[PDB]
Paper text:
Non-hereditary ATTR amyloidosis is an aging-associated disease that arises from the formation of amyloid fibrils from misfolded wild type transthyretin (TTR) protein. The protein is a 55 kDa tetramer that consists of four identical 127 residue protomers. In order to form amyloid fibrils, the tetramer must dissociate and unfold such that the unfolded polypeptide chains are able to reassemble into amyloid. In ATTRwt amyloidosis, amyloid deposits occur mainly in heart tissue of men, where they cause severe cardiomyopathy.
Here we used cryo electron microscopy (cryo-EM) to determine the molecular structure of a human ex vivo ATTRwt amyloid fibril. A 3D map with a resolution of 2.78 Å, based on the 0.143 Fourier shell correlation (FSC) criterion, was reconstructed with the cryo-EM images. The fibril consisted of a single twisted protofilament with a left-hand fibril twist of −1.23° and a rise of 4.82 Å. The density map showed two separate continuous density regions, which after structure modelling, corresponded to the residues Pro11 to Lys35 and Gly57 to Thr123, respectively. The N-terminus lacked resolved density for the residues Gly1-Cys10, whereas the C-terminus lacked density for residues Asn124-Glu127. Between the two regions from position Ala36 to His56, the electron density map was not resolved indicating structural movement or inhomogeneity. The cross section of the fibril resembles a spearhead shape. Two major hydrophobic clusters are detectable. The C-terminal region of the peptide creates a probably water filed cavity, lined with polar and ionic residues Thr59 to Lys80. Glu63 builds a salt bridge with the Lys35 of the n + 1 Layer, which would stabilize the first region with the second. Overall, for all three fibril structures a single fibril layer is formed by a N- and C-terminal fragment of the ATTR peptide and demonstrates a very similar spearhead like shape in their cross section.
Residue numbers in the entry:
A (entry chain F), B (entry chain G), C (entry chain E), D (entry chain D), E (entry chain C), F (entry chain B), ...: 11 to 35, 57 to 123
The structure:
Amino acid sequence: PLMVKVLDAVRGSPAINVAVHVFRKGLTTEEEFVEGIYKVEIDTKSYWKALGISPFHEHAEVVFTANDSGPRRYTIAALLSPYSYSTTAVVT
Amino acid sequence: PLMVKVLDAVRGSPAINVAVHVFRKGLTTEEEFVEGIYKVEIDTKSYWKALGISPFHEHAEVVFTANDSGPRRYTIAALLSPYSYSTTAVVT
Amino acid sequence: PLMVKVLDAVRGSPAINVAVHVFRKGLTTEEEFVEGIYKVEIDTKSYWKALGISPFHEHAEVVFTANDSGPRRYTIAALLSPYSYSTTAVVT
Amino acid sequence: PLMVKVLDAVRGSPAINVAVHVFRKGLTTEEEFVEGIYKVEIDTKSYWKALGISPFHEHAEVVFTANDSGPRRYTIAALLSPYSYSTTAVVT
Amino acid sequence: PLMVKVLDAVRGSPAINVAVHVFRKGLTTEEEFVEGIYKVEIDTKSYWKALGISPFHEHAEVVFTANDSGPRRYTIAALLSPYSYSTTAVVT
Amino acid sequence: PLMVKVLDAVRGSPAINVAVHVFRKGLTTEEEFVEGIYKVEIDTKSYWKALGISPFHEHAEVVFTANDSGPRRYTIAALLSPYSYSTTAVVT
Amino acid sequence: PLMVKVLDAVRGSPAINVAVHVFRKGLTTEEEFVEGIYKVEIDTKSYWKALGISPFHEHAEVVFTANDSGPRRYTIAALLSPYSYSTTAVVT
């Protein structure tokens, strides 16, 4: 008897992000997994990944140049931050 | 008997993002998984990925130049942040 | 008898991020795992990862240059910080 | 009889981040694990990781140059810091 | 009979980060573990990790130069520091 | 009968970070462990780690130069320091 | 009968970081352990660690130069120092 009870009763106006996971049981491999339930990615950069089997195997002169240089701006007042009866403001 | 009960009773006007996962049981491979349930990606950059088997296998001179340089701006007052009885404002 | 009870009763307007995991039981491999339940990544950079089997195996002169140099700005008043009856403001 | 009770009763408007894990039981391998429940990563940099089997195996002259030099700024008033009845402000 | 009771009753508006783990039982390997429950990483840098089996095995002259030199600034008034009935302010 | 009771009753608005772990029972290997429950890492640098089996095995002249020299500044008024009815301010 | 009772009753608004661990029972190996419950690491540097089996095994002239020399500044008014009814201020 696996019984899970979450926020059974609520009297009011809450701000919530419920996440309930009940479980009863190739160069890259992933199996039987839960990812990105609430994963906020901002300005995420992946250049060379999982290129493959025998990549640049022989006489492969490579010139990798990664330049992350820009007037970039990110302004998030509330990230994964539920708020009740409040005042949120990005004043810019 | 697997019983899961979430937010059974609510008295009011809540702001919520419910996520309930009940489970009872090639160069890149993924199996039996839950991804991107609430994954917010902003300015995500992937250049060279899973190129393939035997990519640039022989005498492959490569000149990779990744330049992320721009007047880019991102303004999100509330990201995955449910809010009740509140004031949200991006004043710009 | 596995009984789990979370925030059973609430009288008011709380700000919450509930995470409940009840469980009753290739170069890179991951199995039976929970990732990114609430993982906020900001300005995350991954250059060369999981290149592959026999990458640059023979006579492979490589010139890797990673330059992270930019007028980049990130302003998050509340990250994974639920707030009730409060005042949040990014004044810039 | 495994009974877990968290924040059973609440009288008011709290700010909380509940995390409850009840459990009753390749070059890189991970199994049966919970990661990133609340992992905030900011300006995280990974250059060369899990390159592969036999990478740069023979006569591989490599010139790795990682330069992290930029006018980068990160301003987070509240990180994983739930707050009730308070005043949070990033004044810049 | 394994009974765990946390913050059973609350009368007011607290600021809390509850973490409850009840448990009743390849070059790099990790198994049966809980990581990143609340791990805040800021300006974390990993250069060469888990390169692989037989990396730079023979005649591999390598020139690794890691330069972390930038006008970088990080300002977090409250990190993993829940606060109730208070005033938090990053004035800059 | 393993009974654990934490902060059973609270009358007011405390600021707390509860951590309760009840447990009843490859070059690098870790098993059955709990890490990063509240691990705040700031400016953490790892250069060469877990390179692999037979790394630089023969005639491998290596020039490792790690230079951590930058106008870097980190200002955190409250780190893992919950505060109630107080005034926190990073004035800079 | 293993009974553990912590902060059972609280009358007021305390600032606390509770940590309760009740337990009833490869070149590098760790097993059955709890690490980083509240480990704050600041400016932590690890250069060459767990290189691997047979690293630089034969004729490996190595030039390791680690230079930690920068105008780096770290200012944390309250680290793992919960405070109630007080005034914390980083004035700089």
